[PDB]
């Protein structure tokens, strides 16, 4: 449950039983040949794995430095890496004998991923979403409706994500016998940080094989955006024991690190307990959890996964920040230069990789995790483009 | 040029020259080692080929008939088969020394596909679009602008697709030396029907290898939706000389074939010369081209590919139709049962494959071409709810 001094299981006794049951079931299935055959079968035929490793020739030549490769998670069924974890936990729940899936979502991406995985495996899906988020995300709610899921509008409290998490936990305590709580990032109490990283590690394993086949050598740098940290841990984990492979996590710098309007937990956060884990969280002068900000909804989270807290502490990974403006510039640049519209989350990683490439040799290799496609973000980018001049 | 008694190059002499130059170039490159190496490289690393063949276990089981496999073109970069042809023609153009691509679009889909391919290969992209259509598809116009393409708005005449085609054709007549006219379906004058089919034939070749891996036998039936006919020709062509394999195109039945609001050209159309080809077109009592209808914008074409007319004539492939309602039924059904939101176009093919599955036995196999994903069609589906 620990990554050095980070992680744990800081939950009420009511949640201890369910988590213990999950850990035991995972220990059985994680190395079980049939579980892995079915998972790999669904990832191949339903999700379209493997995703390609793409050499961004035009972007690389424009910068005039390091070769920039994009791990094309944008091409996974659903348009985001989140599908990898949604399939894994849904199949685990079904093989555990669960009949129902519950999850929470703010912007809807995890909700859609969960709804999709549920439909595939013929399980019931209830997604907890704040009614304020429901009114903001009409298409994603319709999507979840289409996929045979019920969006439970959370009218209580702030009608936000926090309230949906509380209602989802309260649901799970009562229903854990037949219901599985599908967490969408490497966050929360053990064993969720480990399970989600294990179900995203396929990104790194493909990327390693693909760069070795294409370039006959390991990458110099791997760059991934870090919200909770699942896409980053996914591409990082298989390279951790490759000492000369630099690992760079890019957090949401928002309106700037000095503005207090960002989600850079590792950069500016303090070590403390929240959402059942010991990790870095954005805190006010008192020590209360400070609200976060990013133009990218997927990065807009006050906390970060404990394994990233560990990788920072042992200095195995460097953690940096890119601003809303820098991410928007990278969104436009990749679109026009390579004909790939990135998720605004992924655009944070593209933004930092473009800066790093300029200072590096043409023989050096950067792999960027392109965690998703930016179709979902077109309204946000249009509004920001209309606010110019 | 000819598929039996259909096809041709029925164009003014201004267009004959450029089309003849395109014929020569395609002949020089179609089997060229380097062109095919680059095309396969872009299809693999950029578009994400090969696309998987998915066994819809739950759909197969609830029907209680033939095993239904889905060729997942919905997973291609851009979310539709159109990308395969966009990359092919865009690369051919670049290797021909063309610096520019032009196209026209009404819904915006072919415009986006062309804009994406042009961006990849570092070519100028101008998309002719009727000012009316521009207003109706603001996000697809934004997409094209994001991808570095210029949307040249056509306010001349009705500000529709017809006007945009004329302006684009006038452009290519002038600019063919440095510009390639990118056609998105197996329609218009030679060599476009043959080129677009050859750049979509990858779908059927992959499907054949994949079905032989999964089942150790060829499929009994292959079902594909037919608008102009590119995705259907793509999955059909490699199985044409496999006599035992049945080929079914599903045209848009619309509000009904009797209602006069449909796009089933091969069904209720008549032979005529329009858009530079001899094929089946929807015609009124005057002989004038009747307006098409389909809830699926991609199937909303009064015309059809000349190679489908040939396959209909020689009875190598059957051509059926499915209503707007049956398609919406299949859109919801695949979404809820298999967790794949299909394009309304692709939903037509799913709908008939569900009917034809019931008729056949459990040991028999249907491959359905899932030509695209339905993210683009969500607003249309909500409106019809
Ligand atoms: Na954070
Ligand atoms: Na038609």
Domains of chain B, earliest start first: 2-43+82-196 (3.40.50.1100), 48-80+201-383 (3.40.50.1100)
Resolution of this model in Å is 2.1
Residue in this structure with the two tokens 């037949």, named with its chain if needed: A178
User: Three-state SS for A329?
Assistant: helix
How far does the CA of residue B335 sit from the closest CA of chain A (Å)? 5
Whether A11 contacts A189, CB under 8 Å: yes
Q: Which ligand is nearest to the CA of B293?
A: 2
Place of tokens 């060729």: B71
Contact A146 B55 (CB under 8 A): no
SS3 of residue A124 by DSSP: strand
Q: Does B54 touch chain A (CB under 8 A)?
A: yes
Joined tokens for residue A277: 């884990």
Residues of B in contact with A337 (CB under 8 A): 119, 148
Task: State how far the Cα of B263 lies from the Cα of A203, in Å rounded to an integer.
Answer: 44
- End-to-end Cα separation, chain A, in angstroms: 51
Residue A227 Cα to ligand 1 midpoint, Å, equals 5
Q: Which H or E run includes A250?
A: strand A246-254
Nearest CA in chain A to B58: A122
Q: Using the 8-state DSSP alphabet, how is residue B290 labeled?
A: P
The answer to whether A218 touches A139, Cβ cutoff 8 Å, is: no
Contacts of A331 by beta carbon, 8 Å cutoff, 6+ apart:
A341, A342, A344, A347, A350, A374, A377, A381, B146
Q: Which pair of structure tokens corresponds to residue B54?
A: 């998915």
Reported in sequence order, the residue ranges of chain B that DSSP labels E, i.e. its strands, are: 2-3, 6-7, 53-55, 67-72, 100-104, 124-130, 150-154, 179-181, 221-225, 246-254, 270-274, 277-281, 317-323, 365-370
Q: Which of A275, A272, A273, A249 is nearest to A161 (CA)?
A: A275
Contact assignment for B339 to A44 by CB distance below 8 Å: no
Count the neighbouring beta carbons within 10 Å of the beta carbon of residue B131: 15
Is any Cβ of chain A less than 8 angstroms from the Cβ of B337? yes
B119 touches chain A (CB under 8 A): yes
Which residue in B67, B82, B290, B312 is the catalytic one?
B82
In the structure, ligand 2 is a single-atom ion and the residues with CB under 5 Å from it are B 263, 265, 301, 304
Distances (CA, A) of B182 to A337, B43, B104, B113, B263: 20, 17, 9, 10, 23
Looking at the complex, report in whole angstroms how far the Cα of residue A293 sits from the nearest Cα belonging to chain B: 25
What DSSP assignment string belongs to A34-53?
HHHHHHHHHHHHTT-PSPPE
| Residues of chain A neighbouring B51 (CB-CB closer than 8 A) | 48
d(CA B330, CA B338): 11
Q: Active-site residues of A: which are they?
A: 82, 104, 371
| C-alpha of residue A5 to centroid of ligand 1, in Å | 18
Judged by DSSP in three states, B64 sits in coil
**Edge-to-edge strand list for the sheet holding A124-130:** A150-154, A124-130, A100-104, A179-181
In degrees rounded to 5, what are phi and psi of residue B120? Answer: -50, -45
Question: Dihedral through CA B52, CA B53, CA B59, CA B65, nearest 10?
Answer: 180
Minimum-distance CB partner of A51 among B48, B74, B119: B48
Short-list A365, A273, A75, CA closest to B79:
A75
Cβ separation A75–B72 shorter than 8 A: no
Chain A residue at shortest CA distance from B50:
A48
Span between the terminal Cα atoms of chain B, in Å: 45
Rounded to whole angstroms, the Cα distance separating A113 from A101 reads 12
Query: How many angstroms away from the CA of B121 is the closest CA of chain A?
Result: 8
Contact B246, B239 (CB under 8 A): no
Q: How far apart are CA A156 and CA A129, in angstroms?
A: 11
Pick the residue from chain A with its C-alpha nearest to B374: A143
Q: Could you say which ligand is closest to the alpha carbon of residue B299? A: 2
Nearest 5°: phi and psi at A236?
-75, -50
Cβ–Cβ contact A145 with B under 8 A: no
CB B378 within 8 A of CB A142: yes
Backbone angles phi, psi at B157, to 5 degrees: 75, -120
Could you tell me if B330 and B298 are in contact, meaning their C-beta atoms sit under 8 angstroms apart? no
The C-alpha atoms of residue A114 and residue A312 are separated, in whole angstroms, by 30
Q: Would an 8 Å CB–CB cutoff place A115 in contact with chain B?
A: yes
| Cβ neighbours for B169, distance < 8 A, ≥ 6 positions apart | B15, B181
Of A44, A148, A375, the CB nearest to B375: A375
Chain A contact for B329 (CB, 8 A cutoff): no
Cα of B168 to ligand 1 centre, how many Å? 49
Nearest to A130 by CA among A162, A90, A99, A91: A162
Nearest to B116 among A58, A339, A375 (CB): A339
User: B274 near B281, Cβ under 8 Å?
Assistant: yes
> CA-nearest residue of chain A to B382?
A142
* Alpha-carbon gap, residue B80 to A124, rounded angstroms: 29
Q: How many residues does chain B have?
A: 385
B201 Cα–ligand 2 center, Å: 20
The answer to whether residue B335 neighbours chain A at the CB level (below 8 Å) is: yes
The whole-angstrom separation of Cα B351 and Cα B326 is: 6
């Amino acid at each position: 449950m620990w990554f050095g001094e980070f992680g744990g299981q800081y939950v009420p006794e009511t949640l201890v039983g369910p988590l213990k049951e999950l850990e035991k079931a995972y220990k059985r299935f994680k190395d079980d040949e049939e579980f892995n055959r079915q998972l790999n079968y669904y990832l191949k035929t339903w999700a379209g794995r493997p995703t390609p490793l793409y050499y961004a020739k035009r972007l690389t030549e424009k910068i005039g430095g390091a070769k920039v490769y994009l791990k094309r998670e944008d091409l996974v069924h659903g348009g985001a890496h989140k599908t990898n974890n949604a399939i894994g936990q849904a199949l685990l729940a079904k093989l555990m004998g669960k009949t129902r899936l519950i999850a929470e979502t703010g912007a809807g991406q995890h909700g859609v991923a969960t709804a999709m995985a549920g439909a595939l495996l013929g399980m019931k899906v209830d997604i907890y979403m704040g009614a304020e988020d429901v009114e903001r995300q009409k298409m994603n709610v319709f999507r979840m409706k289409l996929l045979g899921a019920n969006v439970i509008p959370v009218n209580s409290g702030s009608r936000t994500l926090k309230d949906a998490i509380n209602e989802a936990l309260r649901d799970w305590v009562a229903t854990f016998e037949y219901t599985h709580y599908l967490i969408g990032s490497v966050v929360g109490p053990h064993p969720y940080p480990t399970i989600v990283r294990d179900f995203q590690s396929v990104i790194g394993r493909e990327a390693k094989a693909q760069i070795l086949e294409a370039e006959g050598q390991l990458p110099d740098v791997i760059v991934a955006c870090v919200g909770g940290g699942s896409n980053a841990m996914g591409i990082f984990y298989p390279f951790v024991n490759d000492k000369k492979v630099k690992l760079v996590g890019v957090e949401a710098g928002g309106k700037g690190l000095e503005s207090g309007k960002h989600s850079a937990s590792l950069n500016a956060g303090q070590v403390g307990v929240s959402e059942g884990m010991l990790s870095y969280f954005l805190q006010d002068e008192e020590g209360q959890i400070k609200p976060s900000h990013s133009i990218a909804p997927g990065l807009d989270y006050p906390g970060v996964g404990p394994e990233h807290a560990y990788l920072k502490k042992i200095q195995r990974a460097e953690y940096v920040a890119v601003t809303d403006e820098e991410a928007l510039k990278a969104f436009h640049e990749l679109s026009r230069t390579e004909g790939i519209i990135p998720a605004l989350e992924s655009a944070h990683a593209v933004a930092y990789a473009m800066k790093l490439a300029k200072e590096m040799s043409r023989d050096e290799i950067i792999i960027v995790n392109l965690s998703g496609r930016g179709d979902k973000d077109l309204d946000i980018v249009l509004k920001a483009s209309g606010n110019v001049l």
